C-alpha cells in the first residue's frame, strides 16, 4: 500500500515532522486512490474485529446474537449488513453490568492512562496510554491540514474536565509541536480575562465551540477590544453545528478576520477530528477514512446511502485498542459526497457538515425542523441580536413555531416601530425558509444566556409552550 | 555521587519504574548524606548560573548590577550573599519590556510546549518540551513518596487553565503510570457531579486545594453520599495553607477516612511539589533539594536562617532550561528544621508547612496575625460551621479583630442561647490564641461562599470594617 506507519496496534514515530513545504502530514494515506485505501480499510476492519472478538465479551455477545463472526467480514458490504450497530444505550448497560468501563474496554486495567466521560446515565472513558498517542498523532495530522504549524500559538478554549473536545485539541497541539495554550472554559470571569490574553499573546489558532467564539467577540467588544486584533489565522470548532452553517460561519470569520474550520464526530470516537475540513477544502468536513471508518447509513437498515444522499454517521475505530468502537450509531444527520476535493485529499465529504441529532428534530404541521435551520435563517439577518430560543412541546402536535428572538442593540436604539419591523421580518423569513407559521416574541438585547460550551436553544417544556402561545395570542 | 540521572540539561528515562517494594523513586538522591548532596547542588548551581548568564539578558543585567559573575559562586554561602533575589515584580517588568515571556525565557521560541500563567499584571509561563518532562518526572517521584502507585485512580480536581497546580499534578500522575482522572474545577454544577464520580470510580488519591476538599464533603453530604465511601487512601494539596494546619488537616482526614499530604511552592517554581510531605514524614513538607534548591532566609539580608528559625523561602531551579528561576523570593513565611525524617529521606523539613504570604499579615494592637492562625483556632472548635471572614482595614490602626463566623447547623438548631454560647466561646478562643480582643458576629449556616480554589477570607475594605464595628457596637 505504501501507507505511512500502517500498523495494528498502531505505534507512531513521535519525532516525525512533515517537510515545511508539504500540504499533507501523510501524503500517501491522505491522497492515495480511494479504492486502494478501501482495500487496506477492509484489511484493518478484519484485524480490529478479530481483536474485539478476543478481548471484548461485549462484542463477542452482541455479534453472536446478530449471527456475526469476524471471518464473515469479506467486503465493506458484509460490514454494513452483517455487523450490528452499537448504540450509546448499549455502552451504558455494559458499564452498569461491568463497571467502570464496560466489557468493551479490551486493554488490561494497567494500560489505562486517562479517565474522561459524558455529562448532562453518564459513560466513563478509560483511554489507554497507546490510544492517547494514536489520538494525539491523528489530531496533529488533521490540524496540519488546517494550516496550523509547529511554533504556532494554539488557544484551546473548551472546558478541561470529562469533556474530550479540549483534551483532543490539546493532544494534537502538543504533537504538532505548537505552543499549546490550554486556557480552557467553564468558570465565571474567564472570558473577560481570555480576550486580554488573546490581545497580548496573538494566537494563530483557536479551538472551542462555534457558540463560544460568538460569545467571546461580544465580551471582546464589551472589554473595548477588537477581536480582529487577536492575530488569528483560523478558528477550528467541534461540539455542535455552526462551523458549516452559512450565516454562523460568515459571522465568526467576519468578527475575527480569520478562517473557520469544522471538525468533530463524537467523544466515544476520539480521535473525534476524524471528520474535519482542510485549509483548501474549507467548507464542511472530510471523512479521514484511514483514521476512523465513516459510513453514512439509512437509519432503517444501517446500510450506506449513495453519495449525494442524507443519512446517519456510523463510525469504526481503526487505530484503537482501549474501548474500540465498531459501528457506533451517532444518531446525527448529514449528507455525504465523493467528488474531487480542492486540497487534493481523496476522502468522502460532508459538504454541509452535520445538521444535528435526529432526536433534537421537532415537527410543526407535518414539517420536520432541525434547530440549526432556525439558527441558520436568523444568523443571515442583519437585525438579529445573536441569540434566540425555540419553545416547543412533544406532548401535543404543534400548529405554529414559537420563537423568542433577540434584536440587535442598534435595532432596539432605533425605537418601537424599528423593533416591530424586525419582529415581522424575522417571522416572515423563518416562514419562507421552513414553510410553517412562526410566532416571534422579541426579548431585550443580551438578555438570553450566552455559553462557552454547546448552545441548548430548544425549550421542550409543555407549560412554557402554553404560557408563551397564550401570551402571543393576547398581544 | 551515584545520583540517579544527575545531568544538566536533565533527560529522564520515560520507561523507568521503581521496584514495587521500594519506598523511594530515587533511593540515592533522596536518602544520600545531606553534605554529599550539597556538594552536587553547588556543582549544579554553577551550571545553572552559567546557563542563565549565556541565554538570559534579564539575569545578565541583574547580576552585573549587584556585582555578581557565575565564577564567584564557590560555595552555598556565596550564593546567599552575592546572588540578588528575584522578585515577582522583576518578572512582570521583564515581560512588559520583552513580551511575551520576558528576557529570562532562555530557550528559543521553537522549544515552547505549554503556555500558562497567573490571574487575580499577570505573568505568562512559557514552558519548554524538555522542562515539561522534567516537571512530570519530578512530580511522579514525589507522588510515589506519598504512597501513590501505578494503576491507582488519581482525581485531579483543580481548574485546568492558567493555573499550574492542576497541570503539575496531572503530569506527575501520567508519568507515575497511574489512572489520571482530570475532572478539574471552576464551573457551576461540577462539585455535585464530582461526588457521584468519586462514589462510582473510588479513587486512591485526590488533588486540589484544602478548601475544595472541605466544600466537596459538604456537597457529598447534601447529595446524601458519604465521603468516606469514596475509597480514598490519600488527598494531596497545594495552593494555600491548610494541609499542615492542625484543625484543618484533622477535619479533612476524618471526613474522608484518608491521609492528607501537604505540597506546593509557587507556579513560577514548577515542579512546585519540590516542597512536599511523604507517607511516613506525613506532617509538614520536605525540601527536595536536588529538584529545586530551597533556602529559608531572613527577609532583611536574604541569607539562610539557622534550623529551628522562621524565614522566607527563596527557590532555585536545578532542572529547568525554560524561564529558570534563580533565587526567586516567595514572600511567604515558614520554619525549617534538619532533624532525622521518619521516611529516611535526608532533606530539610518545613514541619508546620507554610504559614502564609507576609503581605497577607495584619496587625491588631502591636500583635502580628496571619489569617491561617484564625482559621487554625476556629477549626479546632466543635461548634464552628466550616466558614468565616476576617474584616480589616490597612488605612488605620486596628484596636480589635472583627470576625464573621458561621456556627454549625446543629448549634443553630439548638436555639438562640446555644448560638450566643458559641459566639462567646469563639471570641474567647481567638483571644486566648492571638492575645488580642476579638469581636465575633454570627452569620447563618452555609451563607458564606465556599470555593473550589483558594480561600480569600480577608475583607480589607475600610467602609466594610467601619460598618461592621459600628453594627457590633449597637448590638
Ligand atoms: C466531538 C466533540 C468531542 O467535540 C463532542 O462534542 O462530542 P460529544 O460526544 O460530547 O457529542 C457529540 C455530538 O455533538 C454533536 N457534534 C459534535 N461535533 C459536531 C459538529 N462538528 N457538527 C455538528 N454536530 C457536532 C453531534 O450531535 C455529536 O453526536
Ligand atoms: C503551588 C501552586 C501551583 O499550587 C500555587 O498555588 O502556586 P501560585 O503561584 O498560584 O501561588 C503560590 C502561593 O500560594 C501559596 N501556597 C501554595 N502552596 C502552599 C502550601 N502548600 N502551603 C501554604 N501556602 C501555599 C503561597 O503563598 C505561594 O506563594
Q: Which fold name corresponds to the CATH topology of the domain at 362-474 in chain A?
A: GMP Synthetase, Chain A, domain 3
Largest sheet data of chain A: 6 strands, antiparallel
Radius of gyration of chain A: 23 Å
* Approximate helicity band of chain A: 25-40%
Structural class of chain A: alpha/beta
The number of distinct β-strands of chain A equals 22
Oligomer: homodimer
Named at the architecture level, the CATH assignment of the domain at 362-474 in chain A is 2-Layer Sandwich
Shape of chain A: globular
Can you offer a commentary on this structure?
- Chains A, B: CoA 3 binds at residues 189, 215, 365, 437.
- The structure is a homodimer of 475-residue chains.
- Chain A has a domain at 362-474: ANL, C-terminal domain (GMP Synthetase, Chain A, domain 3, 2-Layer Sandwich), CATH 3.30.300.
- Helix content of chain A is 35%, strand content 19%.
- Chain A has helices spanning 27-31, 34-55, 57-65, 76-82, 88-97, 129-145, 164-175, 190-201, 210-222, 246-256, 371-379, 409-413, 416-434, 462-474, and strands at 112-117, 124-128, 153-156, 179-181, 205-208, 234-237, 259-262, 275-276, 285-287, 292-298, 303-304, 310-317, 328-329, 332-335, 349-350, 354-357, 362-364, 367-369, 384-391, 401-407, 438-442, 458-459.
- In chain A, strands 10, 11, 12, 13, 14 and 16 form a six-stranded antiparallel β-sheet that branches. In chain A, strands 4-3-5-6-7 form a five-stranded parallel β-sheet, with helices on both faces.
- In chain A, helix 8 (190-201) packs across helix 9, helix 10 crosses helix 11 and helix 11 crosses helix 13 (416-434).
- Chain A is α/β, with parallel strands linked by helices and 475 residues long.
- In chain A, strand 17 (362-364) and strand 18 (367-369) form a beta hairpin.
- Residues 164-165, 238-241, 262, 264-267, 272, 330, 332, 353-354, 357 of chain A line the site of one copy of the ligand CC(C)(O)C(=O)OP(=O)(O)OC[C@H]1O[C@@H](n2cnc3c(N)ncnc32)[C@H](O)[C@@H]1O.
- One copy of the ligand CC(C)(O)C(=O)OP(=O)(O)OC[C@H]1O[C@@H](n2cnc3c(N)ncnc32)[C@H](O)[C@@H]1O binds next to helix 7 and strand 16 of chain A.
Amino acid at each position: 500500500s505504501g501507507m505511512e506507519e500502517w500498523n495494528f496496534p498502531v505505534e507512531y514515530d513521535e519525532n516525525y515532522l512533515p517537510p515545511a513545504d508539504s500540504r499533507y502530514w501523510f501524503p500517501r494515506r491522505e491522497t492515495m486512490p480511494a479504492a486502494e485505501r478501501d482495500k487496506a480499510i477492509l484489511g484493518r476492519l478484519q484485524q480490529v474485529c478479530q481483536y474485539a472478538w478476543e478481548h471484548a465479551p461485549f462484542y463477542r455477545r452482541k455479534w453472536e446474537e446478530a449471527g456475526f463472526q469476524p471471518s464473515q467480514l469479506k467486503s465493506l458490504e458484509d460490514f454494513e449488513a452483517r455487523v450490528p450497530v452499537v448504540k450509546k444505550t448499549d455502552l451504558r448497560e455494559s458499564q452498569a453490568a461491568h463497571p467502570p468501563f464496560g466489557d468493551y474496554v479490551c486493554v488490561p486495567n494497567s494500560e489505562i492512562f486517562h479517565v474522561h466521560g459524558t455529562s448532562g446515565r453518564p459513560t466513563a472513558f478509560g483511554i489507554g496510554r497507546a490510544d492517547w498517542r494514536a489520538i494525539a498523532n491523528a489530531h496533529a495530522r488533521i490540524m496540519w491540514g488546517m494550516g496550523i504549524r509547529p511554533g504556532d500559538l494554539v488557544c484551546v478554549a473548551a472546558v478541561f474536565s470529562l469533556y474530550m473536545g479540549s483534551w483532543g485539541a490539546l493532544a494534537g497541539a502538543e504533537r504538532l509541536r505548537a505552543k499549546a495554550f490550554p486556557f480552557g472554559a467553564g468558570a465565571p470571569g474567564m472570558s473577560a480575562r481570555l480576550v486580554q490574553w488573546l490581545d497580548t499573546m496573538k494566537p494563530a489558532a483557536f479551538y472551542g465551540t462555534p457558540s463560544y467564539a460568538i460569545h467571546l467577540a461580544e465580551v471582546a467588544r464589551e472589554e473595548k477590544l477588537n477581536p480582529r486584533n487577536f492575530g488569528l489565522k483560523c478558528l477550528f470548532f467541534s461540539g455542535e453545528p455552526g462551523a458549516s452553517v452559512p450565516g454562523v460561519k460568515d459571522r465568526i470569520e467576519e468578527a475575527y478576520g480569520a478562517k473557520v474550520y469544522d471538525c468533530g464526530s463524537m467523544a466515544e470516537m476520539s480521535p473525534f477530528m476524524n471528520v474535519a475540513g482542510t485549509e483548501q477544502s474549507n467548507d464542511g468536513m472530510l471523512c479521514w477514512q484511514d483514521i476512523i471508518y465513516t459510513e453514512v447509513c439509512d437509519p432503517a437498515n444501517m446500510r450506506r446511502v449513495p453519495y449525494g444522499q442524507r443519512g446517519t454517521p456510523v463510525y469504526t475505530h481503526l487505530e484503537r485498542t482501549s474501548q474500540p468502537m465498531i459501528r457506533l450509531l451517532s444518531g446525527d444527520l448529514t449528507l455525504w459526497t465523493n467528488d474531487e476535493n480542492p486540497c487534493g485529499r481523496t476522502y468522502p465529504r460532508l459538504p454541509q457538515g452535520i445538521f444535528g441529532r435526529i432526536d433534537d428534530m421537532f415537527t410543526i404541521r407535518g414539517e420536520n425542523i432541525y434547530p440549526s435551520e432556525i439558527d441558520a435563517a436568523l444568523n443571515q439577518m442583519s437585525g438579529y441580536g445573536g441569540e434566540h430560543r425555540i419553545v416547543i412541546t412533544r406532548e401535543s402536535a404543534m400548529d405554529e413555531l414559537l420563537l423568542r428572538v433577540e434584536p440587535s442593540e442598534s435595532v432596539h436604539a432605533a425605537g418601537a416601530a424599528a423593533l416591530e419591523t424586525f419582529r415581522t421580518e424575522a417571522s416572515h423569513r423563518v416562514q419562507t425558509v421552513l414553510g410553517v407559521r412562526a410566532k416571534v416574541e422579541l426579548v431585550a438585547p443580551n438578555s438570553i444566556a450566552r455559553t462557552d460550551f454547546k448552545a441548548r436553544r430548544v425549550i421542550d417544556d409543555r407549560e412554557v409552550f402554553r404560557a408563551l402561545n397564550q401570551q402571543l395570542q393576547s398581544s
